[PDB]
Design a protein around this ligand. Structure first.
Ligand SMILES: [Zn+2]
Lengths: 142, 192, 59, 142, 76, 65, 62, 100
RNA sequence: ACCUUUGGGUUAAGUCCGCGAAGUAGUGAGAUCCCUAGGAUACGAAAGUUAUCGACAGGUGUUAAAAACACAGGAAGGAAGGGGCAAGAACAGGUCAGUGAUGCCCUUAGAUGGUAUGGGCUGCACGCGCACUACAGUGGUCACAGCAGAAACAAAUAGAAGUAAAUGUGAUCGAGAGGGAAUGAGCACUGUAAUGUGCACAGGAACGAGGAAUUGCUAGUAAUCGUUAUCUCAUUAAGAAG
């Protein structure tokens, strides 16, 4: 069954984030404490653990993609998902992508842990990454 | 989720046993039409008295989409008034709906100033307002009082809505809308 | 303005004098008769003719 | 085969499709989320409104899945409300006696005709010599 | 005079005595009756709602509303 | 024509060749009248807005709406 | 002070004033024999009830 | 066995006549005959100012050319394809074929 | 030489109804297309597409005729909505810098004809016309979701075009933490050439809602918000047309 849809996103993304950090499965980019997520953003994130909320939300994008049986997700797709409206002085605001470097690092970390498999046209889940999510949800709803 | 009963406003408020309490106004104030959320797209504006059949709190949220920058933001208006009803229901202790009804009743001016002179110079005189125009002006004044009050003041906008509406229902000098109703009626009398 | 125009009133007047007994109080009968007898090349016109003819037939 | 009907509902450029089916329990899903999980409350208010003018005993033993594309957040809620409204009447006409269909239809028609008929209203095309459908550019004299 | 960034002991004492018998109270009241800034009206209000001295009655987006000892709702 | 230019490297002794890209008005002259301005370039027409309107009905364009 | 008379509109006659803003109307008072002629400025329907400040001031032109 | 025949044309009356003619031919041979499929018309458009100079109220015109099209998918033997292709000439309609 | 005759009602329209020394046929309007909205009994086994149909002031109510509103049902209701086409007569209205459309005057190897390398059209005391960001809290910032008209997207370890944005939830900031003008040492891209564009770090001007005047707009309209596999286009949109 499509088990992921049974719980609310603003409870799931915070929940997994702790399981990640307590096992260090993803490691921060150099200068994560001062870098911005996009050229469209005004200031760096208010939470020091923003890198882990990215990791938690990336696995959610992949779980729902797997649930709906879509084509595999690309680095471009993820960059447009996290995009925003950039401020340009005296000109209309304009839609701009997220920066790729963060996303590339997360996907390469998850590859080394065996959580994400690279296909010829995108990235895909693996059995361990599915079962972690399954066993979390089964407690979390109860 | 919250209820499986009959239709209540914001799923909270009774929607029954409502009195207008001015026979001059009776036919022109819709408190009949049971709606869960103050939103409808009913296309009555293309009709001769169709804007008098739109429900009361609907007319009241439309009044908020103003000052230019807020045009079209009808969700924002609903968010604002929802909160105001919580403040008012608490403060007053009675269906927010009867506060809104009584605010309208008091805040419409009964006599007005107009040019009458046709075959010469235009000389100002007092004149008597119709039922429909009387309520149109009531909403206008209640809205204008709220907007200008909040502009560069630290207080929250839903709170200012509760301040004005209570006072208006109670016919107190404290209401911007009530004062300006006195002014118009005094000038009308001056030109009588 | 919903005024019928010259050819529509003229054809209406001629048909009631030419075929009077064939006509009735009913729009659909009258529409059938003008569909049957006339050369009129659009339903847009013959809807208007049969409208005027059934407006006359009462009077 | 299991008893089923399908209906379509439209508002502006939003289109929605509802499938309705026999069940041991009343169930309703929109965007794969139940009413107690779905993220927009205007949609939830517009659903529980129509569910109360129809008697609860008429929605018993029945299941719904709503899918939609096009338009925007307010327009899709009304599109969904029509699709839902037409499903119950369609099912009653097909699988019960026709008097109950007529009874339910009188109640919905007394409340809001726009629950069972679609508004033919759409945006008007822009003409030249103005910013929009009717507004003109500013003429000048001296 | 400008607003303040402390709730000193004697302001704290009298606020407890004042919050009873008040009905609905909000961020502004603490900041427009007494001299506190918005950033210290939040912190004090949140504290009293943990102490069971006040009770929260709404918290939708950032708009947040509270009640004191002489509140009483409608009845059916 | 795709013209070519010689250029020297920093040594001012070795030479290489680079190609000039065809861009701007210089090669997009109106096929009816040699004009450089108001040329419609869509659908691989290369005809100016003045010439277009007299020939449009011969080509097969119509004003429906 | 809040003196008031309630009157019932029986007829409307003429669109009147610069720009045609007013309507000449005939009104009968609810608890007196008096019947007046008045100008009123909002939209008005026959059988409306209107609240007057004076029972005497009149628009004789009718 | 199968053939798909695309009749493509920037004139509606011609395409209507030629398709009615070919439909008649199909039903006269009676191989379980059927109507053509009406395709989404291709529409190429240009928008330009009317005046040859800057003077006056700027008035604009939209010209659009419509390429209508109709598809027959059909069952025939190879001889009947080869022989019937004699029908597919001396038309302002352009005619194209697909086969499997 | 000229007039066809008494100027009373109606429509968007001599569009029509009365009456007449007048009466009969036509052009223009109108009717007559095209797009958008509803409709299989047709076609397909894929799940859509197209459709000779549907609305007439027809019904009721308004006491000459012609029209009309206001209700009601209806996907559509008074020219169904929006375009497109569109009399006669005129004007010394604009364009000879669109034209191998053109009369007449002028120049024509030291050219008023071509080409190349550079410079200007982009200069700056100053008066005017039309646009864009603003003057904050119905705001700023951080994250996270999530939806168009439909369907196109090598890679990238700070960063150097792209598949909405307003918007929805939680945090944060607190009344020039709004605003981004002139300017510095850099780091890249397009290009034959930077003078043009992107990026990072600074820097931080006026402006705190506008005198006399003045411009559009009746419903999915005005205003808001993005977006253009639309036009300009090597690179350049704060312009038009959607
Ligand atoms: Zn040309």
């Amino acid at each position: 069954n499509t088990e992921i849809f049974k719980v609310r996103h603003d409870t799931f993304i915070p929940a997994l984030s702790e399981y990640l950090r307590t096992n260090k499965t993803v490691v921060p980019i150099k200068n994560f404490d001062i870098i911005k997520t996009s050229r469209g953003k005004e200031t760096s994130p208010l939470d020091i653990n923003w890198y882990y909320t990215r990791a938690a939300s990336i696995i959610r994008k992949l779980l729902i993609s797997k649930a709906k049986n879509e084509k595999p997700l690309s680095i471009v797709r993820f960059s447009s998902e996290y995009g925003c409206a950039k401020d340009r002085g005296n000109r209309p605001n304009k839609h701009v992508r997220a920066s790729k470097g963060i996303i590339i690092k997360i996907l390469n970390d998850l590859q080394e842990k065996g959580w994400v498999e690279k296909k010829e046209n995108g990235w895909t889940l693996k059995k361990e990454a599915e079962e972690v999510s399954k066993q979390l949800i089964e407690k979390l709803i109860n | 989720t919250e209820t499986s009963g009959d239709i209540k406003l914001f799923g909270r408020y009774p929607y029954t046993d409502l009195e207008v309490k001015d026979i001059t106004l009776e036919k022109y104030i819709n408190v009949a039409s049971k709606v869960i959320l103050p939103h409808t797209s009913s296309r009555l504006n293309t009709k001769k008295f169709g804007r008098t059949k739109i429900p009361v709190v609907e007319r009241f949220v439309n009044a908020m989409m103003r000052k230019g920058r807020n045009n079209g933001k009808k969700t924002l208006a609903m968010r604002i008034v929802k909160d105001a009803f919580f403040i008012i229901e608490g403060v007053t202790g009675q269906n927010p709906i009867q506060i809104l009804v009584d605010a309208i009743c008091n805040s419409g001016p009964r006599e007005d100033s107009a040019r009458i002179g046709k075959g010469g110079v235009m000389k100002r005189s007092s004149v008597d307002v119709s039922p429909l125009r009387r309520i149109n002006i009531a909403i206008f004044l209640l809205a204008k009082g709220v907007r200008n009050s909040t502009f560069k003041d630290i207080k929250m906008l839903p709170e200012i809505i509760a301040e004005e509406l209570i006072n208006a229902a109670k016919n107190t000098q404290s209401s911007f809308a009530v004062k300006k109703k006195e002014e118009i009626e005094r000038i009308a009398k001056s030109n009588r | 303005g919903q005024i019928k125009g010259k050819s529509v009133r003229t054809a209406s007047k001629v048909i009631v004098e030419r075929y009077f007994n064939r006509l009735t109080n009913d729009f659909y009968d009258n529409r059938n008769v003008v569909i049957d007898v006339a050369e009129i090349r659009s339903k847009k016109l013959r809807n208007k003719v049969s409208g005027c003819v059934t407006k006359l037939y009462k009077r | 085969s299991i008893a089923q009907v399908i209906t379509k509902g439209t508002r502006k450029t939003a289109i929605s499709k509802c499938v309705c089916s026999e069940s041991n329990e009343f169930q309703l899903m929109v965007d794969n989320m139940t009413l107690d999980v779905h993220h927009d409350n205007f949609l939830v208010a517009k659903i529980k409104e129509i569910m109360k003018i129809i008697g609860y005993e008429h929605l018993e033993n029945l299941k719904f899945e709503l899918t939609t594309r096009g338009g925007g957040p307010i327009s899709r809620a009304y599109a969904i409300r029509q699709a839902f409204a037409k499903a119950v009447i369609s099912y009653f006409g097909k699988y019960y006696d026709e008097q109950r269909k007529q009874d339910i239809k009188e109640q919905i028609m007394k409340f809001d005709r726009a629950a069972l008929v679609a508004d033919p209203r759409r945006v008007e095309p822009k003409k030249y010599g103005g910013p929009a459908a009717r507004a003109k550019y500013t003429k000048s004299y001296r | 005079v400008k607003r303040h960034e402390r709730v000193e002991d004697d302001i704290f004492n009298k606020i407890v005595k004042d919050v009873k018998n008040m009905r609905i109270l909000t961020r502004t009241t603490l900041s427009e009756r007494y001299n506190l800034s918005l950033n210290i009206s939040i912190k004090l209000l949140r504290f009293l709602e943990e102490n069971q001295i006040i009770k929260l009655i709404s918290s939708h987006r950032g708009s947040k509303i509270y009640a004191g000892s002489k509140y009483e709702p409608l009845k059916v | 024509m795709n013209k070519q230019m010689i250029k020297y490297n920093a040594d001012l002794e070795t030479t290489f060749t680079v190609e000039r890209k065809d861009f701007g008005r210089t090669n997009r002259r109106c096929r009816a009248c040699f004009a450089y301005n108001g040329v419609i370039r869509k659908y691989d027409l290369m005809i100016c807005r003045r010439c277009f309107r007299e020939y449009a009905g011969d080509i097969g364009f119509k004003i429906y709406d | 002070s809040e003196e008031v008379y309630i009157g019932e509109v029986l007829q409307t006659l003429e669109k009147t004033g610069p720009g045609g803003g007013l309507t000449m109307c005939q009104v009968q008072l609810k608890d007196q024999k008096r019947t007046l002629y008045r100008a009123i400025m909002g939209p008005i329907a026959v059988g409306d009830l209107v609240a007057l400040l004076d029972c005497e001031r009149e628009h004789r032109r009718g | 066995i199968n053939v798909e025949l695309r009749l493509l044309c920037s004139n509606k009356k011609l395409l209507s006549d030629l398709s009615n003619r070919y439909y008649n031919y199909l039903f006269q041979n009676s191989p379980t005959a059927k109507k053509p499929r009406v395709l989404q018309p291709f529409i190429c458009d240009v928008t330009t100012r009317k005046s040859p100079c800057g003077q006056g109220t700027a008035t604009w015109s939209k010209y659009k050319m419509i390429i209508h099209g109709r598809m027959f998918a059909l069952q025939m033997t190879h001889q009947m394809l080869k022989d019937s292709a004699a029908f597919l000439q001396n038309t302002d309609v352009e005619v194209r074929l697909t086969l499997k």
